[PDB]
Paper text:
Repulsive guidance molecules (RGMs) are cell surface proteins that control processes ranging from brain development to iron metabolism. RGMs can bind to the cell guidance receptor Neogenin (NEO1) and act as coreceptors for the bone morphogenetic proteins (BMPs). Structural analysis of RGMs and their complexes with NEO1 and BMP2 revealed a common RGM architecture comprising an N-terminal domain (RGMND) essential for BMP binding and a C-terminal domain (RGMCD) sufficient for NEO1 binding. Here, we determined high-resolution structures of all three human RGMs in complex with the BMP ligand growth differentiation factor 5 (GDF5) and the ternary complex of GDF5 with RGM and NEO1.
Second, the RGMB α3 helix stretches across the two GDF5 fingers. Under these conditions the RGMB ectodomain (RGMBECD) bound GDF5 with an apparent affinity (Kd) of 8.8 μM, and the N-terminal domain alone (RGMBND) exhibited a Kd of 2.7 μM, suggesting that RGMBND comprises the major domain for GDF5 binding. Mutations of RGMB at either of two key RGMB–GDF5 interactions (Leu103Glu and His106Arg) abolished binding to GDF5. In solution the 2:2 RGMB–GDF5 complex is stable at pH 7.5, but dissociates at pH 5.5, similarly to the RGMB–BMP2 complex.
Residue numbers in the entry:
A (entry chain A), C (entry chain A): 397 to 501
B (entry chain B), D (entry chain B): 53 to 68, 82 to 121
The structure:
């Protein structure tokens, strides 16, 4: 039972059957968030005010409100070179592709 | 300004009524300069709840 | 076992022992998010690309990656009239206080 | 432009291999105009996984 932290999560577009329309890259590290959001919340989690209030109310009465969940708070984009709907090779920057920090919400 | 996040990080990263009194003191040493921040009052209320729950 | 949705969550500052420094309001509706994030994700959840990929990989292999969590995606601020650290009555707008929409992340 | 979100919302809000074929057809009717969107390919792969899992 650890705390909200960032763990590794690799994605392989070729294994997902997307290699027919995606040229490069065929795989990348995307990470994910996992862990308990116990009271109190650390400064590195930089939670929202509502997350703070919900964590406090769940610590007081667990049968009154569920705890906050470990979720990505900051994500970084990655580039993808793919064949579009008109057979045009497009270099597009997809946002929210790699988890760079986790937190409680 | 306020020093609630430092004490909170220390107390959390420690346990990852022993040090609950130490954390309460760390929060009380900045009781005046943190009157208004939701994090400080939340930490104080959680400390009170943990003191009332562990029978100490 | 319902889906990711917004449920009611009331907060009472007077019950939390904050009535000594908070003048008004003493209570407000903050809501919260709760429910499963099953595949596929609806349009109203407006998930991120990483959330989509994680939901897909969890639907394929649940033992490979945990599912996305139901969390607030848009929050609205509320005003609070309180006595500050210098005995000055301050009307401050606190952000991220009321959940207005839920989603999967 | 693409109509993956409408079919996805319909298929999800329905169940809240019966209509899996109907959802696959709803996604296939926009197979050309959605070549590039991650949501469409994710829905297609999930439909394939559900077809291969329920033995149909």
């Amino acid at each position: 039972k650890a705390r909200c932290s960032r763990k590794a999560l690799h994605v392989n577009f070729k294994d997902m059957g997307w290699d027919d329309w995606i040229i490069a890259p065929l795989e990348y590290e995307a990470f994910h968030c996992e862990g308990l959001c116990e009271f109190p919340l650390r400064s590195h989690l930089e939670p929202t005010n509502h997350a703070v209030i919900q964590t406090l109310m769940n610590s007081m009465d667990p049968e009154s409100t569920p705890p906050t969940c470990c979720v990505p708070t900051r994500l970084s984009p990655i580039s993808i070179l793919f064949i579009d709907s008109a057979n045009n090779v497009v270099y597009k920057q997809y946002e929210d592709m790699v988890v760079e920090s986790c937190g409680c919400r | 300004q306020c020093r609630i996040q430092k004490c909170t990080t220390d107390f959390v990263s420690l346990t990852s009524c022993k040090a609950l009194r130490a954390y309460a003191g760390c929060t009380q040493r900045t009781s005046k300069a943190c009157r208004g921040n939701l994090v400080y009052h939340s930490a104080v209320l959680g400390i009170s709840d943990l003191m009332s729950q562990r029978n100490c």
